[model samples]
Target chain A: HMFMRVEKIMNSNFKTVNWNTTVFDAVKIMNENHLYGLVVKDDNGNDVGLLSERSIIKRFIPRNKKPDEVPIRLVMRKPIPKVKSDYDVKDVAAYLSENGLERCAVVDDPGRVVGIVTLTDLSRYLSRASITDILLSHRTKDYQHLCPKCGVGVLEPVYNEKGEIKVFRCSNPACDYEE
Target chain B: LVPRGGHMFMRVEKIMNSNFKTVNWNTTVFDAVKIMNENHLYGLVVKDDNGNDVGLLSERSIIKRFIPRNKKPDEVPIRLVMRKPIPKVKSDYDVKDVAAYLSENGLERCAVVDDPGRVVGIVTLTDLSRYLSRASITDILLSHRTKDYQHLCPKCGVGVLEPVYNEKGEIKVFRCSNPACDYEE
Candidate 1:
């Protein structure tokens, strides 16, 4: 959707590892979970870097570096650019694609990571609808998923704690519509 | 007016490498690494002696199963470390569907295979990322982005240009986005 905020669909439950952890242990977490990209954090709970398959192929193994002897910080990708939860899906796709990054952390104003979106995640989203269609027409009233009363805005769904659709609210700021 | 529709619904064959390689399960990790090194690849399709597509041996798999274990690469066979029954997709598979499969499954690559489960080629996250990153919203021009990357494709005249770097990270030439054009500079 053109204005579809990432918060609506992002997988908020994400995995992370301490920066000081050995690449060996970090890898164990990956293997156990079948994770490709593992987020790395600092002692103060700051999201620092990422360790993906690329890190292993390009940085760790190629140099013949021993995974046990090396900390994740040594081979992980650093200073990960943050993707705000409210970022437009199209913009998110563009940023990731342009930079050749597979996944990114979704954070809030305080820089606390709340979700994670990988290229695979985007791919999954795109499988339902092409990028062009998402960018051009969101779930707006024009496309049929609109506000009931105003009939001018899209009906954005609100989810419960269990991620079930609890209610659908109108996207129009000035209008109050929900069911 | 921007051209639309035809390339939008592209299939896997448009991008997959049909000449991809497959390794035998008995191949040593040492030799497999050499094969990957020489080919400048990150993964290889794996098959049993009977030539049945069975697994995938990528850098990640080696790192996960072999590297930390301190196993002798020369002594360990690929089958011991290769990820088995890796997700397979047909050549005409939808690009979006394959991307979903890789991400949802936490895989970096998928084997492009025949109906008989024979490896035909491979598709990776890098390839998908590159394809998905192409210009989608061409109408909204980013004035700031244009400064750093001014080399829009001279061939396609619409798509962005990317560099082909050697193994040592040296840029050799910039290739046009649309592979159909076959233009490089």
Candidate 2:
């Protein structure tokens, strides 16, 4: 259901940091915004990068061993993923599914990142619009676990606090399966 | 995603694998890694049960120390293989702030502890990333814009915009400085 445009719910006030911001500074921004990723933008408000939690896990933390002096640029994911602001929520979700991304910078054609979208955002829109449809859609056997076009994620072991492990056999291998 | 948490922020818990073996201050480099493998860990915290964290013994330290002595992982108590001053954070601090702390510190496992320095939980880099995933982007707009921002033309750049908040606290109105671009969503 395309009840609301993605642009309508976009965050124009998303706080950003320079790609070179210190790890200590990055944490301050997250604390202030209550978020995990910060837009690493250009001087003109264009997002050329994104500093997410995954970057911290994959790169910096493994090597930095010392966070105080490290710069965020050393670990940020570049060539930032983006979507058009005028796009519908479904369109945004499709983009993320295709890209294997949890968040995408919502931008204008001019390349200025005006807002941001996340899988969670699409979930919210679905909840507000046709909650039943979204839930029912999930129940459909045709709704593969992973989008076939974007291989964002694949079969992975997910364990619970109780040590119960389950294998997520993603059918849609084309979608972005992981963040 | 919209913004999460109001001014009422929650606490962050940091931790580490403190169960690994440690060497005394006078131990040799060869005895450290031998114990590291026994615990099936890459590193260990050199701290006592009283919670007095002293230093760290890691795979990296052995490499740095071995260039001169040419030691092996099986031969080291990690005294000489230790890296000083492990990074840590308090439990009462906010999660968002903790993200920055972990980034700035480059710590995968930020040791969360009590006032007496007792290790409680370990806040991993993954935890922070998951926290980001769970956050609501809409909340970011509401708080940041509410205090002082104008919702104006995405292009002409400078007309002030006012966002109206409803009884349910959701954004319902959008007014802009550019008369042509100004309107509610």
Candidate 3:
């Protein structure tokens, strides 16, 4: 909980949807993929919002709107809370729990979504379940912590005073790596 | 670490239906019922002339208490039909406490109030079932990523492991979708 990074447990194959994608299609993708939510991307492919079951119940049903007729842009949770693969797992959970939300998209250096991490994963870890599900077919997943400058060491994230990741340093005492 | 008693620490507001509708006290029972039907909400927060939420008017209450006696719902206001000093819970109450209060007082769904006593949402059996049975988490999937061993069961080949969230909405453990298979992770 203290040092484990969000990237370590994040699921990389998250589904993305366009802002204009109808709720009908998004829900189909979610049901087919066994996903509870989808990342909303802009025309330029930037993560802009999220659509979840909560949206369908709270916003969609209340309006008595049809799934195919209403676009996700009209119902999805917007001004999304963002997290980085390098973010501490605990911090990410804190942000979501405090904000009364369940999920967040994991981004990489490109400022693009690379994965998803949610309260579900945190629950799995805390329950002491084998998150080895994430480790089993580890395809050198985008979250590896090996220091770029010094391959022998792991990298740790540093945050600014206001609590966003702004520093990256090598774990090895002798290595001079920093980002 | 507890399995079934997730209510002890979980707060009610987190799982409460944050989206609730309020009707002016003077609104005809006929008009308020329309909002309830349209929103699919069982109850509406009833507000007074001062714009203060004073009661909760439920569909069942109207049917059982008002409909049999009053034929003119269009003339009778919700203020007349609604139960008085509506059943309430602090937004921050533990799920356990909420349950204790509800069942003890023979209350069904009740309204959630925040600071200065404002009704913000409501909690009902529907919400409790969703919380207790672990509907908060997504069902495990058989996706392209699961190229290795799948979480599906052999006894019931299609029974995927369903992760259940604790009262706090965290998935601490999971079980098989098919109750007969008895699998967990």
Candidate 4:
């Protein structure tokens, strides 16, 4: 289950932005890169915090403040939980899940930001494995008949009074599409 | 029990709140707010007659869209202001993927739909956070031994103090990272 290490799974090719940058510019970078969060660094080139989509929506959009005028530091979550590169993937995943953190900075021995690990990365990898396993285990292809009338409902296997699969019933409560 | 890092392997339906609240599209904003306040809910799914989720009504939406517009809550229908095309995830989705999906989508909550596309339950950030918090990494060691700190100098907002190492290779002092800024603590 824990075959991978954090260093292997962590995304090293990530983006970073200065804390003094405008919220609008930072978010634009996030959107352009398809990143949910960016590693926020200070003037000294040390990782300080994380600026995420959650922060943008939770802090900036609601205040009605000008994003271009507001600095990222104002909305960034400070004292972010930093993780070591050599940590196990399972432990890292647990820490991320426990703290409800979507992304965290992965630092080196000198405490310099080298990469980042996100829940999305972890989920994508893990889900693919599980989904692949499920698909392989189920060799039999069972066709789930769809309801012809409503098109949204699937015909579920129903048993009659004799406890036999006598007919198909529509799963949609209101559809009543049975066959 | 789910293996460590296997949290994402669990189906979303296992963690989603089945006994969730819902509202009709035509429900008055005032009534919705009252119910939310009474029930201590931050958000609720808005469903059509067929129990299909059409939108989501949340405190953020009300504050950002409704209060600013100065529309009468009693007169305004929830459908008019509800966040349309509400994000939906399948019940078969992994919990971790759902969290990632919600975070990526910038949504605090979303409706969980069954195979038939009927809204069966709702999952919130709080719920996922709580579930994740329950899984403890007992063997992991969390330390702050690094010299990295974010305490900015009082003089300059941009320059952060870097650690000054002593002869023994320990951080004994701090200095501004910026050469132009002489401020130090």
**Native contact fraction, candidates in order:** 0.10, 0.00, 0.00, 0.00
Error (Å) of candidate 3 at residue B50 is 37
lDDT for each candidate structure: 0.61, 0.49, 0.59, 0.59
**lDDT digits (tens) for residues B1-185 of candidate 3:** 12344442567888787888888888876567657644556578888888877678864445333332223455556765565467689999876677655554444468999977878898764455334323222112121112112234334656765545555333334466886787654
The TM-score between candidate 2 and the true structure equals: 0.38
lDDT of 3 at A72: 81
TM-score of each: 0.53, 0.38, 0.40, 0.46
Best-performing candidate as measured by DockQ: 1
Model 4 regions more than 4 Å off: A1-3, A61-64, A124-179, B1-16, B19-53, B57-120, B123-185
Docking class of 2: incorrect
Per-residue CA lDDT of model 3 for A106-154, tens digit only, reads 8898888888776666544432222212221111122224565767776
Instruction: Place model 1 in a CAPRI quality band.
Output: incorrect
Compose the digit string of candidate 4's lDDT tens values, residues B1-185: 12234343567787777877889988876667656644656578887777767688875455333433333455556765566566689999876677666655556567898999887888765455433322211001011011111334435656765556445333334566777899643
Q: What CA root-mean-square deviation does each model show from the true structure? A: 21.1, 19.7, 19.4, 23.6
**Which RMSD does model 4 reach against the true structure?**
23.6
- For candidate 2, give the lDDT: 0.49
Model 3: how far residue A93 lies from native, Å: 1.4
